[PDB]
Amino acid sequence: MTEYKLVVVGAGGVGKSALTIQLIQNHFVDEYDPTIEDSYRKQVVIDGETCLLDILDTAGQEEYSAMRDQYMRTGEGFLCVFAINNTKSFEDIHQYREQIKRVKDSDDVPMVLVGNKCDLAARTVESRQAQDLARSYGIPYIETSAKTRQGVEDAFYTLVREIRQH
Ligand SMILES: Nc1nc2c(ncn2[C@@H]2O[C@H](COP(=O)(O)OP(=O)(O)NP(=O)(O)O)[C@@H](O)[C@H]2O)c(=O)[nH]1
Ligand SMILES: [Ca+2]
Ligand SMILES: [Ca+2]
Ligand SMILES: [Ca+2]
Ligand SMILES: [Mg+2]
């Protein structure tokens, strides 16, 4: 079976862990525990292929972002996450993308842009704005909620499909 090495990156609090944990363990994490670096592994069937997802959940806080560069180097695809109720996290995305380009030493890295927390009504980032950004990078935009499960499978699976196009 093929292994896919997925990396989840973005600002602190945007819901990286919650998204990952919702995909792998099928429940919502209500509390906020800042992440250092954790991995998860699940065998899944995606478009007929049995594959091993290896997911690295990275830190978003400056204080906890110690070995992040080194860990991200082996990533085959990256989930770039912001929260639709946090404009600064959307503004920060470019910096995460620049870091992926450094760490992979390449212009062409499989990525998906993710607007998380789409269950909340306090939207400051409109879909159209995220779509444009994603369009400039040549990647898709998917909105997700880790709370309701909406788009969660779709976002990670799309990322596998992006890696397959590489
Ligand atoms: N309503 C809602 N809340 C969410 C969602 N995703 C995450 N949260 C909430 O936001 C907080 C932070 O989520 P978490 O996954 O820890 O964020 P993170 O990106 O892994 N934080 P860090 O970068 O510090 O590791 C948690 O209290 C969590 O319940 C979502 O889709 N909807
Ligand atoms: Ca819970
Ligand atoms: Ca602001
Ligand atoms: Ca606005
Ligand atoms: Mg986390």
CSV table of N, CA and C and ligand atoms in Angstrom, one decimal:
chain,number,residue,atom,x,y,z
A,1,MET,N,0.8,-1.2,0.0
A,1,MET,CA,0.0,0.0,0.0
A,1,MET,C,0.9,1.3,0.0
A,2,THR,N,0.3,2.3,-0.6
A,2,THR,CA,1.0,3.6,-0.6
A,2,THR,C,0.8,4.3,0.7
A,3,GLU,N,1.9,4.9,1.2
A,3,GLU,CA,1.8,5.8,2.3
A,3,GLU,C,1.7,7.3,1.8
A,4,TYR,N,0.8,8.1,2.4
A,4,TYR,CA,0.7,9.5,2.1
A,4,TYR,C,1.1,10.3,3.4
A,5,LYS,N,2.1,11.1,3.3
A,5,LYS,CA,2.6,11.9,4.4
A,5,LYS,C,2.0,13.3,4.4
A,6,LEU,N,1.0,13.5,5.2
A,6,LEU,CA,0.2,14.7,5.3
A,6,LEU,C,0.7,15.6,6.4
A,7,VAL,N,0.8,16.9,6.2
A,7,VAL,CA,1.2,17.8,7.3
A,7,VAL,C,0.1,18.9,7.4
A,8,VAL,N,-0.3,19.2,8.6
A,8,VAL,CA,-1.3,20.2,8.9
A,8,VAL,C,-0.6,21.4,9.5
A,9,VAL,N,-0.7,22.6,8.9
A,9,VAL,CA,-0.1,23.8,9.3
A,9,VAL,C,-1.0,25.0,9.3
A,10,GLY,N,-0.7,26.0,10.0
A,10,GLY,CA,-1.5,27.2,10.2
A,10,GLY,C,-1.3,27.8,11.6
A,11,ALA,N,-1.9,29.0,11.8
A,11,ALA,CA,-1.8,29.7,13.0
A,11,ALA,C,-2.4,29.0,14.2
A,12,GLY,N,-2.0,29.4,15.4
A,12,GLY,CA,-2.5,28.8,16.7
A,12,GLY,C,-4.0,29.1,16.8
A,13,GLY,N,-4.7,28.0,17.2
A,13,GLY,CA,-6.1,28.1,17.5
A,13,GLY,C,-7.0,27.9,16.3
A,14,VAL,N,-6.5,27.7,15.1
A,14,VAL,CA,-7.4,27.6,13.9
A,14,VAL,C,-8.2,26.3,13.8
A,15,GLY,N,-7.7,25.3,14.5
A,15,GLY,CA,-8.4,24.0,14.5
A,15,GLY,C,-7.7,22.8,13.9
A,16,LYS,N,-6.4,22.9,13.8
A,16,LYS,CA,-5.6,21.8,13.1
A,16,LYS,C,-5.7,20.5,13.8
A,17,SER,N,-5.5,20.5,15.1
A,17,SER,CA,-5.7,19.3,15.9
A,17,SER,C,-7.1,18.8,15.9
A,18,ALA,N,-8.1,19.6,16.1
A,18,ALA,CA,-9.5,19.2,16.0
A,18,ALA,C,-9.9,18.6,14.7
A,19,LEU,N,-9.4,19.2,13.6
A,19,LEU,CA,-9.6,18.6,12.2
A,19,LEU,C,-9.0,17.2,12.2
A,20,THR,N,-7.7,17.1,12.6
A,20,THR,CA,-7.0,15.8,12.5
A,20,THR,C,-7.7,14.8,13.3
A,21,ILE,N,-7.9,15.1,14.6
A,21,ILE,CA,-8.6,14.2,15.5
A,21,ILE,C,-10.0,13.8,15.1
A,22,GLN,N,-10.7,14.7,14.4
A,22,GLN,CA,-12.0,14.4,13.9
A,22,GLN,C,-11.9,13.4,12.7
A,23,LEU,N,-10.9,13.5,11.9
A,23,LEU,CA,-10.7,12.5,10.8
A,23,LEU,C,-10.3,11.2,11.4
A,24,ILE,N,-9.4,11.1,12.3
A,24,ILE,CA,-8.8,9.9,12.8
A,24,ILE,C,-9.6,9.2,13.8
A,25,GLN,N,-10.2,10.0,14.8
A,25,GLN,CA,-10.9,9.4,16.0
A,25,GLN,C,-12.3,9.7,16.1
A,26,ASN,N,-12.9,10.5,15.1
A,26,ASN,CA,-14.3,10.7,15.0
A,26,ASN,C,-15.0,11.3,16.2
A,27,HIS,N,-14.3,12.3,16.8
A,27,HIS,CA,-14.9,13.1,17.8
A,27,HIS,C,-14.3,14.5,17.8
A,28,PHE,N,-15.0,15.5,18.4
A,28,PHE,CA,-14.6,16.9,18.5
A,28,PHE,C,-13.9,17.2,19.8
A,29,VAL,N,-12.8,17.8,19.7
A,29,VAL,CA,-12.0,18.3,20.8
A,29,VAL,C,-12.5,19.8,21.1
A,30,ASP,N,-13.3,19.9,22.2
A,30,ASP,CA,-13.8,21.2,22.6
A,30,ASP,C,-12.8,22.1,23.3
A,31,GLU,N,-11.8,21.6,24.0
A,31,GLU,CA,-10.8,22.3,24.7
A,31,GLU,C,-9.7,22.7,23.8
A,32,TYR,N,-8.9,23.7,24.2
A,32,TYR,CA,-7.7,24.2,23.5
A,32,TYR,C,-6.4,23.8,24.3
A,33,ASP,N,-5.8,22.7,23.8
A,33,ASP,CA,-4.4,22.3,24.3
A,33,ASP,C,-3.5,22.6,23.1
A,34,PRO,N,-2.6,23.6,23.2
A,34,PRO,CA,-1.6,23.9,22.2
A,34,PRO,C,-0.7,22.7,21.9
A,35,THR,N,-0.4,22.4,20.6
A,35,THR,CA,0.3,21.3,20.1
A,35,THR,C,1.8,21.6,20.0
A,36,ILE,N,2.6,20.6,20.2
A,36,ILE,CA,4.1,20.7,19.9
A,36,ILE,C,4.2,20.0,18.5
A,37,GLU,N,4.3,18.7,18.5
A,37,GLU,CA,4.4,17.9,17.2
A,37,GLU,C,3.8,16.6,17.6
A,38,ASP,N,2.7,16.2,17.0
A,38,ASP,CA,2.1,14.9,17.1
A,38,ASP,C,1.9,14.2,15.8
A,39,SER,N,2.0,12.9,15.7
A,39,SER,CA,1.6,12.2,14.5
A,39,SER,C,0.4,11.3,14.7
A,40,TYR,N,-0.3,11.0,13.6
A,40,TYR,CA,-1.4,10.0,13.7
A,40,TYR,C,-1.3,9.1,12.4
A,41,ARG,N,-1.7,7.9,12.6
A,41,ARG,CA,-1.7,6.9,11.5
A,41,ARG,C,-3.0,6.2,11.4
A,42,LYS,N,-3.6,6.2,10.2
A,42,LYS,CA,-4.8,5.4,9.9
A,42,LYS,C,-4.8,4.9,8.5
A,43,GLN,N,-5.1,3.6,8.4
A,43,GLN,CA,-5.3,2.9,7.2
A,43,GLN,C,-6.7,3.2,6.7
A,44,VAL,N,-6.8,3.7,5.5
A,44,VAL,CA,-8.1,4.1,4.9
A,44,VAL,C,-8.3,3.7,3.4
A,45,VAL,N,-9.5,3.6,2.9
A,45,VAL,CA,-9.7,3.3,1.5
A,45,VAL,C,-10.2,4.7,0.9
A,46,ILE,N,-9.4,5.2,-0.1
A,46,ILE,CA,-9.7,6.4,-0.8
A,46,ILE,C,-9.6,6.1,-2.3
A,47,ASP,N,-10.7,6.4,-2.9
A,47,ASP,CA,-10.9,6.1,-4.4
A,47,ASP,C,-10.5,4.7,-4.8
A,48,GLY,N,-10.8,3.7,-3.9
A,48,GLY,CA,-10.5,2.3,-4.2
A,48,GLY,C,-9.1,1.8,-3.7
A,49,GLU,N,-8.2,2.7,-3.4
A,49,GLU,CA,-6.8,2.4,-3.0
A,49,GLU,C,-6.8,2.3,-1.4
A,50,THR,N,-6.3,1.2,-0.9
A,50,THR,CA,-6.0,1.1,0.5
A,50,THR,C,-4.7,1.8,0.7
A,51,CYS,N,-4.7,2.8,1.6
A,51,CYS,CA,-3.5,3.6,1.9
A,51,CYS,C,-3.3,3.9,3.3
A,52,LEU,N,-2.1,4.2,3.7
A,52,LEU,CA,-1.7,4.6,5.0
A,52,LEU,C,-1.5,6.1,5.0
A,53,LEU,N,-2.4,6.8,5.8
A,53,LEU,CA,-2.2,8.2,6.0
A,53,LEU,C,-1.3,8.4,7.2
A,54,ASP,N,-0.3,9.1,7.0
A,54,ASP,CA,0.6,9.5,8.1
A,54,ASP,C,0.5,11.0,8.3
A,55,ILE,N,-0.2,11.5,9.3
A,55,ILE,CA,-0.5,12.9,9.5
A,55,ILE,C,0.3,13.5,10.6
A,56,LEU,N,1.0,14.5,10.3
A,56,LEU,CA,1.7,15.4,11.3
A,56,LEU,C,0.9,16.6,11.6
A,57,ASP,N,0.5,16.8,12.9
A,57,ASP,CA,-0.2,17.9,13.4
A,57,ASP,C,0.9,18.8,14.0
A,58,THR,N,1.1,20.0,13.3
A,58,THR,CA,2.2,20.9,13.7
A,58,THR,C,1.7,22.0,14.7
A,59,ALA,N,2.6,22.6,15.4
A,59,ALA,CA,2.3,23.8,16.2
A,59,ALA,C,2.0,25.0,15.4
A,60,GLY,N,1.1,25.8,15.9
A,60,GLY,CA,0.8,27.1,15.4
A,60,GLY,C,1.3,28.3,16.3
A,61,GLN,N,1.6,28.0,17.5
A,61,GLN,CA,2.1,29.0,18.4
A,61,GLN,C,3.6,29.2,18.2
A,62,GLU,N,4.1,30.4,18.2
A,62,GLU,CA,5.6,30.7,18.1
A,62,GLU,C,6.3,29.9,19.2
A,63,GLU,N,5.9,30.0,20.4
A,63,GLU,CA,6.5,29.3,21.6
A,63,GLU,C,6.7,27.8,21.4
A,64,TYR,N,5.8,27.1,20.7
A,64,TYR,CA,5.9,25.7,20.6
A,64,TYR,C,6.4,25.2,19.2
A,65,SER,N,6.8,26.1,18.3
A,65,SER,CA,7.1,25.8,16.9
A,65,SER,C,8.6,25.4,16.7
A,66,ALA,N,9.2,24.7,17.7
A,66,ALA,CA,10.6,24.5,17.7
A,66,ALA,C,11.2,23.8,16.5
A,67,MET,N,10.9,22.5,16.4
A,67,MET,CA,11.5,21.7,15.3
A,67,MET,C,10.7,21.6,14.0
A,68,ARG,N,9.8,22.6,13.8
A,68,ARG,CA,8.7,22.5,12.8
A,68,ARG,C,9.3,22.3,11.4
A,69,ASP,N,10.3,23.2,11.0
A,69,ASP,CA,11.0,23.0,9.8
A,69,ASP,C,11.4,21.6,9.5
A,70,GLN,N,12.2,21.0,10.4
A,70,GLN,CA,12.7,19.6,10.3
A,70,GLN,C,11.6,18.6,10.0
A,71,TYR,N,10.6,18.6,10.9
A,71,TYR,CA,9.4,17.8,10.8
A,71,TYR,C,8.7,17.9,9.4
A,72,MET,N,8.5,19.1,8.9
A,72,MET,CA,7.8,19.4,7.7
A,72,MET,C,8.5,18.9,6.4
A,73,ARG,N,9.9,18.8,6.4
A,73,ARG,CA,10.7,18.4,5.3
A,73,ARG,C,10.2,17.1,4.5
A,74,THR,N,9.7,16.1,5.3
A,74,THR,CA,9.3,14.9,4.7
A,74,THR,C,7.8,14.9,4.2
A,75,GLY,N,7.1,16.0,4.4
A,75,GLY,CA,5.7,16.1,4.0
A,75,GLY,C,5.5,16.0,2.5
A,76,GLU,N,4.6,15.2,2.1
A,76,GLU,CA,4.3,15.1,0.6
A,76,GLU,C,3.2,16.0,0.2
A,77,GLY,N,2.2,16.3,1.1
A,77,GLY,CA,1.2,17.3,0.9
A,77,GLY,C,0.9,18.0,2.2
A,78,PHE,N,0.5,19.3,2.1
A,78,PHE,CA,0.2,20.2,3.2
A,78,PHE,C,-1.2,20.7,3.2
A,79,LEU,N,-1.8,20.6,4.4
A,79,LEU,CA,-3.1,21.2,4.6
A,79,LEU,C,-2.9,22.6,5.2
A,80,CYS,N,-3.1,23.7,4.5
A,80,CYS,CA,-3.0,25.1,5.0
A,80,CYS,C,-4.3,25.6,5.6
A,81,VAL,N,-4.3,25.7,6.9
A,81,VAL,CA,-5.6,26.0,7.6
A,81,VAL,C,-5.6,27.4,8.2
A,82,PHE,N,-6.7,28.1,8.0
A,82,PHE,CA,-7.1,29.3,8.7
A,82,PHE,C,-8.5,29.0,9.3
A,83,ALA,N,-8.9,30.0,10.1
A,83,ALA,CA,-10.3,30.0,10.6
A,83,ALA,C,-11.1,31.1,10.0
A,84,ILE,N,-12.3,30.8,9.5
A,84,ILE,CA,-13.1,31.8,8.8
A,84,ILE,C,-13.5,33.0,9.7
A,85,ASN,N,-13.3,32.8,11.1
A,85,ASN,CA,-13.6,33.9,12.0
A,85,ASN,C,-12.3,34.6,12.6
A,86,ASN,N,-11.2,34.4,11.9
A,86,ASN,CA,-9.9,34.9,12.3
A,86,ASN,C,-9.1,35.4,11.1
A,87,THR,N,-9.3,36.7,10.8
A,87,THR,CA,-8.7,37.4,9.6
A,87,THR,C,-7.2,37.3,9.7
A,88,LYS,N,-6.5,37.5,10.8
A,88,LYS,CA,-5.1,37.4,11.0
A,88,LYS,C,-4.6,36.0,10.5
A,89,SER,N,-5.3,34.9,10.8
A,89,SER,CA,-4.9,33.6,10.4
A,89,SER,C,-4.9,33.4,8.9
A,90,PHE,N,-5.9,34.0,8.3
A,90,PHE,CA,-6.0,34.1,6.8
A,90,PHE,C,-4.8,34.9,6.2
A,91,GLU,N,-4.6,36.0,6.8
A,91,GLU,CA,-3.4,36.9,6.4
A,91,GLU,C,-2.1,36.1,6.5
A,92,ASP,N,-1.9,35.4,7.6
A,92,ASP,CA,-0.7,34.6,7.9
A,92,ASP,C,-0.5,33.4,6.9
A,93,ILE,N,-1.5,33.0,6.1
A,93,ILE,CA,-1.3,31.8,5.2
A,93,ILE,C,-0.1,31.9,4.3
A,94,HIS,N,0.0,33.0,3.7
A,94,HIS,CA,1.2,33.3,2.8
A,94,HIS,C,2.5,32.8,3.4
A,95,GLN,N,2.7,33.2,4.7
A,95,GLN,CA,3.9,32.9,5.4
A,95,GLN,C,4.1,31.4,5.6
A,96,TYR,N,3.0,30.7,5.9
A,96,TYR,CA,3.0,29.2,5.9
A,96,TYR,C,3.4,28.6,4.6
A,97,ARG,N,2.9,29.2,3.5
A,97,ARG,CA,3.1,28.7,2.2
A,97,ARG,C,4.6,28.9,1.8
A,98,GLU,N,5.1,30.1,2.1
A,98,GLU,CA,6.5,30.4,1.9
A,98,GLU,C,7.5,29.4,2.7
A,99,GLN,N,7.1,29.1,3.9
A,99,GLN,CA,7.8,28.1,4.7
A,99,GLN,C,7.8,26.7,4.1
A,100,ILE,N,6.7,26.3,3.5
A,100,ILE,CA,6.6,25.0,2.8
A,100,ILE,C,7.5,25.0,1.5
A,101,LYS,N,7.4,26.1,0.8
A,101,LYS,CA,8.4,26.3,-0.4
A,101,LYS,C,9.8,26.2,0.0
A,102,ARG,N,10.3,26.8,1.2
A,102,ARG,CA,11.6,26.6,1.7
A,102,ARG,C,12.0,25.2,2.1
A,103,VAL,N,11.1,24.6,2.9
A,103,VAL,CA,11.3,23.3,3.5
A,103,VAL,C,11.3,22.2,2.4
A,104,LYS,N,10.5,22.3,1.4
A,104,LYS,CA,10.5,21.4,0.2
A,104,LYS,C,11.5,21.8,-0.9
A,105,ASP,N,12.0,23.1,-0.9
A,105,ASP,CA,12.9,23.7,-1.8
A,105,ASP,C,12.3,23.5,-3.2
A,106,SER,N,11.0,23.9,-3.4
A,106,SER,CA,10.2,23.7,-4.6
A,106,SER,C,9.0,24.6,-4.7
A,107,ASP,N,8.6,25.0,-5.9
A,107,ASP,CA,7.4,25.8,-6.3
A,107,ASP,C,6.1,25.0,-6.3
A,108,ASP,N,6.3,23.7,-6.5
A,108,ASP,CA,5.2,22.9,-6.8
A,108,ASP,C,5.1,21.8,-5.8
A,109,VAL,N,4.3,22.1,-4.7
A,109,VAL,CA,4.1,21.2,-3.6
A,109,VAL,C,2.6,21.0,-3.4
A,110,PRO,N,2.1,19.8,-3.3
A,110,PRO,CA,0.7,19.6,-3.1
A,110,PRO,C,0.2,20.3,-1.9
A,111,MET,N,-0.9,21.0,-2.1
A,111,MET,CA,-1.5,21.8,-1.0
A,111,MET,C,-3.0,21.9,-1.1
A,112,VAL,N,-3.7,22.1,0.0
A,112,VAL,CA,-5.1,22.5,0.0
A,112,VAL,C,-5.3,23.6,1.0
A,113,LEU,N,-6.0,24.7,0.6
A,113,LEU,CA,-6.3,25.7,1.5
A,113,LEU,C,-7.6,25.4,2.3
A,114,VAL,N,-7.6,25.5,3.6
A,114,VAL,CA,-8.7,25.1,4.4
A,114,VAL,C,-9.2,26.3,5.3
A,115,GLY,N,-10.5,26.6,5.1
A,115,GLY,CA,-11.1,27.6,6.0
A,115,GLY,C,-12.0,26.8,7.0
A,116,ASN,N,-11.4,26.7,8.2
A,116,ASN,CA,-12.0,25.9,9.2
A,116,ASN,C,-13.0,26.7,10.1
A,117,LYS,N,-13.9,26.0,10.8
A,117,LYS,CA,-14.8,26.6,11.8
A,117,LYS,C,-16.0,27.2,11.0
A,118,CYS,N,-16.4,26.6,9.9
A,118,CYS,CA,-17.5,27.1,9.1
A,118,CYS,C,-18.9,26.9,9.7
A,119,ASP,N,-18.9,26.2,10.9
A,119,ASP,CA,-20.1,26.2,11.8
A,119,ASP,C,-20.4,27.5,12.5
A,120,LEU,N,-19.5,28.4,12.6
A,120,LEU,CA,-19.6,29.7,13.3
A,120,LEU,C,-20.2,30.8,12.4
A,121,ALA,N,-21.0,31.6,12.9
A,121,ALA,CA,-21.6,32.7,12.1
A,121,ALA,C,-20.8,34.0,12.1
A,122,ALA,N,-19.7,34.1,12.9
A,122,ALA,CA,-18.9,35.3,13.0
A,122,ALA,C,-17.8,35.3,12.0
A,123,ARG,N,-18.2,35.2,10.7
A,123,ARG,CA,-17.3,35.2,9.6
A,123,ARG,C,-16.7,36.5,9.3
A,124,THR,N,-15.4,36.6,9.2
A,124,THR,CA,-14.6,37.8,8.7
A,124,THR,C,-13.9,37.5,7.4
A,125,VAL,N,-13.7,36.2,7.0
A,125,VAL,CA,-13.1,35.9,5.7
A,125,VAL,C,-14.2,35.2,4.9
A,126,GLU,N,-14.6,35.9,3.8
A,126,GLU,CA,-15.6,35.4,2.8
A,126,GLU,C,-15.0,34.3,2.0
A,127,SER,N,-15.8,33.4,1.5
A,127,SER,CA,-15.4,32.3,0.6
A,127,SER,C,-14.7,32.9,-0.6
A,128,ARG,N,-15.3,33.9,-1.3
A,128,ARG,CA,-14.7,34.4,-2.5
A,128,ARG,C,-13.2,34.9,-2.3
A,129,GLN,N,-12.9,35.4,-1.1
A,129,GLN,CA,-11.5,35.9,-0.8
A,129,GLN,C,-10.6,34.8,-0.6
A,130,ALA,N,-11.0,33.7,0.0
A,130,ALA,CA,-10.2,32.5,0.1
A,130,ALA,C,-10.0,31.8,-1.2
A,131,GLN,N,-11.1,31.8,-2.1
A,131,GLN,CA,-11.0,31.2,-3.4
A,131,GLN,C,-10.0,31.8,-4.3
A,132,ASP,N,-9.9,33.2,-4.2
A,132,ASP,CA,-8.9,33.9,-5.0
A,132,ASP,C,-7.5,33.6,-4.6
A,133,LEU,N,-7.3,33.5,-3.3
A,133,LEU,CA,-6.0,33.2,-2.8
A,133,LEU,C,-5.6,31.8,-3.3
A,134,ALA,N,-6.5,30.9,-3.1
A,134,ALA,CA,-6.2,29.5,-3.5
A,134,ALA,C,-5.9,29.4,-5.0
A,135,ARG,N,-6.7,30.2,-5.8
A,135,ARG,CA,-6.5,30.3,-7.2
A,135,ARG,C,-5.1,30.8,-7.6
A,136,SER,N,-4.6,31.8,-6.8
A,136,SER,CA,-3.2,32.3,-7.1
A,136,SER,C,-2.1,31.3,-6.8
A,137,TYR,N,-2.4,30.4,-5.9
A,137,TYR,CA,-1.5,29.3,-5.6
A,137,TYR,C,-1.7,28.0,-6.5
A,138,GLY,N,-2.8,28.0,-7.3
A,138,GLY,CA,-3.1,26.8,-8.1
A,138,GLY,C,-3.6,25.6,-7.3
A,139,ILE,N,-4.3,25.9,-6.2
A,139,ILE,CA,-4.8,24.8,-5.4
A,139,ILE,C,-6.3,25.0,-5.0
A,140,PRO,N,-7.0,24.0,-4.5
A,140,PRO,CA,-8.4,24.1,-4.1
A,140,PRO,C,-8.6,24.8,-2.7
A,141,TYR,N,-9.8,25.3,-2.5
A,141,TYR,CA,-10.3,25.8,-1.2
A,141,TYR,C,-11.5,25.0,-0.8
A,142,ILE,N,-11.4,24.5,0.4
A,142,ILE,CA,-12.5,23.7,1.0
A,142,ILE,C,-12.7,24.3,2.4
A,143,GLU,N,-14.0,24.6,2.8
A,143,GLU,CA,-14.4,25.0,4.1
A,143,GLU,C,-14.8,23.7,4.9
A,144,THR,N,-14.3,23.8,6.2
A,144,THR,CA,-14.5,22.7,7.1
A,144,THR,C,-15.0,23.1,8.5
A,145,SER,N,-15.7,22.2,9.2
A,145,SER,CA,-15.9,22.4,10.6
A,145,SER,C,-15.5,21.1,11.2
A,146,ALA,N,-14.5,21.2,12.2
A,146,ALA,CA,-14.1,20.0,13.0
A,146,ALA,C,-15.2,19.7,14.0
A,147,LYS,N,-16.1,20.6,14.3
A,147,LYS,CA,-17.2,20.3,15.3
A,147,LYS,C,-18.3,19.5,14.6
A,148,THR,N,-18.8,19.9,13.5
A,148,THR,CA,-19.9,19.1,12.8
A,148,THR,C,-19.4,18.0,11.9
A,149,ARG,N,-18.1,17.9,11.6
A,149,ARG,CA,-17.6,17.0,10.6
A,149,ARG,C,-17.7,17.4,9.1
A,150,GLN,N,-18.3,18.6,8.9
A,150,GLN,CA,-18.5,19.0,7.5
A,150,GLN,C,-17.2,19.3,6.8
A,151,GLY,N,-17.0,18.7,5.6
A,151,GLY,CA,-15.8,18.9,4.8
A,151,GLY,C,-14.5,18.3,5.3
A,152,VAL,N,-14.5,17.5,6.4
A,152,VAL,CA,-13.3,17.1,7.1
A,152,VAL,C,-12.6,16.0,6.2
A,153,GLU,N,-13.4,14.9,5.9
A,153,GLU,CA,-12.9,13.9,5.0
A,153,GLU,C,-12.5,14.4,3.7
A,154,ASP,N,-13.4,15.3,3.1
A,154,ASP,CA,-13.2,15.9,1.8
A,154,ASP,C,-11.9,16.7,1.7
A,155,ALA,N,-11.6,17.5,2.8
A,155,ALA,CA,-10.3,18.2,2.8
A,155,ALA,C,-9.0,17.4,2.7
A,156,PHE,N,-9.0,16.4,3.6
A,156,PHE,CA,-7.8,15.5,3.7
A,156,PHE,C,-7.7,14.6,2.4
A,157,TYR,N,-8.9,14.2,1.9
A,157,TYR,CA,-8.9,13.3,0.8
A,157,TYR,C,-8.5,14.0,-0.5
A,158,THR,N,-9.0,15.3,-0.6
A,158,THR,CA,-8.6,16.2,-1.7
A,158,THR,C,-7.1,16.3,-1.7
A,159,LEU,N,-6.5,16.5,-0.5
A,159,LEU,CA,-5.0,16.6,-0.4
A,159,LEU,C,-4.3,15.3,-0.9
A,160,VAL,N,-4.8,14.2,-0.6
A,160,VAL,CA,-4.3,12.9,-1.2
A,160,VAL,C,-4.4,13.0,-2.7
A,161,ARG,N,-5.6,13.4,-3.2
A,161,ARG,CA,-5.8,13.6,-4.7
A,161,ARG,C,-4.8,14.6,-5.4
A,162,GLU,N,-4.4,15.6,-4.6
A,162,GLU,CA,-3.4,16.6,-5.1
A,162,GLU,C,-2.0,15.9,-5.1
A,163,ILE,N,-1.7,15.1,-4.2
A,163,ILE,CA,-0.4,14.4,-4.1
A,163,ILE,C,-0.3,13.5,-5.3
A,164,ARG,N,-1.4,12.7,-5.6
A,164,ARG,CA,-1.6,11.9,-6.8
A,164,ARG,C,-1.4,12.6,-8.1
A,165,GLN,N,-1.8,13.8,-8.2
A,165,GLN,CA,-1.6,14.7,-9.4
A,165,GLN,C,-0.1,15.1,-9.6
A,166,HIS,N,0.7,15.0,-8.5
A,166,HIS,CA,2.1,15.4,-8.6
A,166,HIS,C,3.0,14.4,-9.3
B,1,LIG,N1,-16.7,25.8,16.6
B,1,LIG,C1,-15.6,25.3,16.2
B,1,LIG,N2,-14.5,25.3,17.0
B,1,LIG,C2,-13.4,24.7,16.7
B,1,LIG,C3,-13.2,24.1,15.4
B,1,LIG,N3,-12.0,23.6,15.3
B,1,LIG,C4,-11.4,23.9,16.4
B,1,LIG,N4,-12.2,24.6,17.3
B,1,LIG,C5,-11.9,25.0,18.6
B,1,LIG,O1,-10.8,25.9,18.6
B,1,LIG,C6,-9.9,25.6,19.7
B,1,LIG,C7,-8.5,25.3,19.1
B,1,LIG,O2,-8.6,24.1,18.3
B,1,LIG,P1,-7.2,23.3,18.1
B,1,LIG,O3,-7.5,22.1,17.1
B,1,LIG,O4,-6.6,23.0,19.4
B,1,LIG,O5,-6.4,24.4,17.3
B,1,LIG,P2,-4.9,24.1,16.8
B,1,LIG,O6,-4.7,24.7,15.5
B,1,LIG,O7,-4.5,22.6,16.8
B,1,LIG,N5,-4.0,24.9,18.0
B,1,LIG,P3,-2.3,24.9,18.0
B,1,LIG,O8,-1.7,25.6,16.7
B,1,LIG,O9,-1.9,25.8,19.3
B,1,LIG,O10,-1.9,23.5,18.1
B,1,LIG,C8,-10.5,24.4,20.5
B,1,LIG,O11,-11.1,24.9,21.7
B,1,LIG,C9,-11.5,23.9,19.5
B,1,LIG,O12,-12.6,23.3,20.1
B,1,LIG,C10,-14.4,24.1,14.5
B,1,LIG,O13,-14.4,23.6,13.3
B,1,LIG,N6,-15.5,24.7,15.0
B,2,CA,CA,-15.5,16.6,22.8
B,3,CA,CA,-7.2,42.5,12.9
B,4,CA,CA,-13.9,42.0,5.1
B,5,MG,MG,-2.9,21.8,17.8
